[PDB]
């Protein structure tokens, strides 16, 4: 019933892979390019599915990965993410392994050449990583300078509550407005972040951060909107 009504699955399911999602008594199967109906999902929240990924090998369907599939939906943007629970060993055998990654980031991308030529926007939204959807993203874009900066707060893991350093709005090869910059924790480079700008009026940002931690690189999905 509400937008974003539809997300193309592209990163989330690769060609000839099969992605099954389950929630309650429903189960749906998806292949590369297929549409996920985000129209019925709650805006401004993480929607939860169980997933399994399969492929044919030597004529038999096998499992590649199982776990939880997360969707954060906004009005003009959404993003998917995977919490793996089991993954192919290396050998035709699953092994337990928990890792988190961002899947598709999509929506009505704002054109770089049609951005607001002036003014300041403040975006407020959610940062979510492994086992933690409770983080809070604040981000600010100065369209006069075409710089953005922000930060993540309230994630349970304190090393994840980083600053998103000032970075430029540039066009990518589709002429979409995107931001790529650095992440700081306590005044130290601790990774990077990426945001696209979405909505005809730059109403939303959505992307991800990769944060250096003692436990390895940790991924954070990012989405926010203006009032």
């Amino acid at each position: 019933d509400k937008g974003l009504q539809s997300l193309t699955l592209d990163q989330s399911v690769r060609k000839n892979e099969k992605l099954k999602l389950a929630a309650q008594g429903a189960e749906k199967t998806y292949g590369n390019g297929d549409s996920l109906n985000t129209g019925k999902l709650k805006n401004d929240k993480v929607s939860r599915f169980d997933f399994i990924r399969q492929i044919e090998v030597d004529g038999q369907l096998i499992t590649l990965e199982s776990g939880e599939f997360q969707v954060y939906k906004q009005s003009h943007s959404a993003l998917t993410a995977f919490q793996t629970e089991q993954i192919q060993d290396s050998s035709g055998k699953m092994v337990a392994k928990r890792q988190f990654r961002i899947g598709d980031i999509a929506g009505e991308h704002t054109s770089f050449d049609k951005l607001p030529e002036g003014g300041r926007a403040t975006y407020r939204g959610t940062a979510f990583g492994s086992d933690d959807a409770g983080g809070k993203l604040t981000y600010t874009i100065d369209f006069a300078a075409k710089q953005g900066n922000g930060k993540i707060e309230h994630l349970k893991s304190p090393e994840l509550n980083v600053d998103l350093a000032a970075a430029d709005i540039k066009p990518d090869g589709k002429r979409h407005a995107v931001i790529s910059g650095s992440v700081l924790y306590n005044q130290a480079e601790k990774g990077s972040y990426s945001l696209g700008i979405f909505g005809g009026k730059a109403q939303e940002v959505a992307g991800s951060a990769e944060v250096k931690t003692v436990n390895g690189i940790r991924h954070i999905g990012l989405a926010a909107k203006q009032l």
Epitope: Q24, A26, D50, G67, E68, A96
Partner: antibody, heavy 122, light 109 residues
């Protein structure tokens, strides 16, 4: 070690209700789908129901679709089967079962419980 | 709602003989989603073989599995007395999950 302890079975009359419990120990509970499987006296194994590791997906044999409710508590390492409207044929030993992965199917039962007996009669 | 039909229903064999248990599906089942369980009387079932040919933790090399399509086989090359029990094949690649009706391995004397 990996242990599955069923409780809550017993004797009810037709139409009655029982709340099976299964206490999991020895593994990371939330990472594995769990199932209930039953065995009527002298007969074979019949799959009853299963629930994903996260608790977000569930499925049931049509026999108990509407009557039985599977659930779990990943904070307390507990699996439940709520059996409402019990019937004569539901009489059986009910086994808790741990599968080898998170999805509610595509994984084998790698651990079985001891079984809790359910009897439905007058 | 695949139907698994195990044959024979009862199999009477001497220790040290070779046992061939058969499981026939009503449609093709992927090798990745077929297992065998052993159940001794007054005991819960136990996983034996998973994914058609993979022995589980604590199952002897004596036990072996094979198959593909609609036809699967469990083999006990040389039967120990401990192997005389009921065997169940199960498919877990489609919903609802299904178990065959069992094959009882009797100790001939």
């Amino acid at each position: 070690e990996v242990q599955l302890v069923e409780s809550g079975g017993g004797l009810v009359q037709p139409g009655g209700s029982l709340r099976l419990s299964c206490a999991a120990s020895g593994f990371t509970f939330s990472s594995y789908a769990m199932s209930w499987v039953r065995q009527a006296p002298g007969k074979g194994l019949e799959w009853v129901s299963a629930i994903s590791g996260s608790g977000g997906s569930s499925h049931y044999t049509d026999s108990v679709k509407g009557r039985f409710t599977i659930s779990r508590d990943n904070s307390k390492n507990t699996l439940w089967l709520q059996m409402n409207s019990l019937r004569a044929e539901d009489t059986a030993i009910y086994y808790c079962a741990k599968t080898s992965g998170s999805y509610y199917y595509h994984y084998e039962i790698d651990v079985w419980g001891q079984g809790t007996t359910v009897t439905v009669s007058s | 709602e695949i139907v698994l039909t195990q044959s024979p229903g009862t199999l009477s064999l001497s220790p040290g003989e070779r046992a061939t248990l058969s499981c026939r599906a009503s449609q093709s089942v992927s090798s990745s989603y077929l297992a065998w369980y052993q159940q001794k009387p007054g005991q819960a079932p136990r996983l034996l073989i998973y994914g058609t040919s993979n022995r589980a933790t604590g199952i002897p090399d004596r036990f072996s599995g094979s198959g593909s399509g609609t036809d699967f086989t469990l083999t006990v090359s040389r039967l120990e007395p401990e192997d005389f029990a009921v065997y169940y094949c199960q498919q877990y690649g489609s919903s609802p999950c299904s178990f065959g009706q069992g094959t009882k391995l009797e100790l001939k004397r």
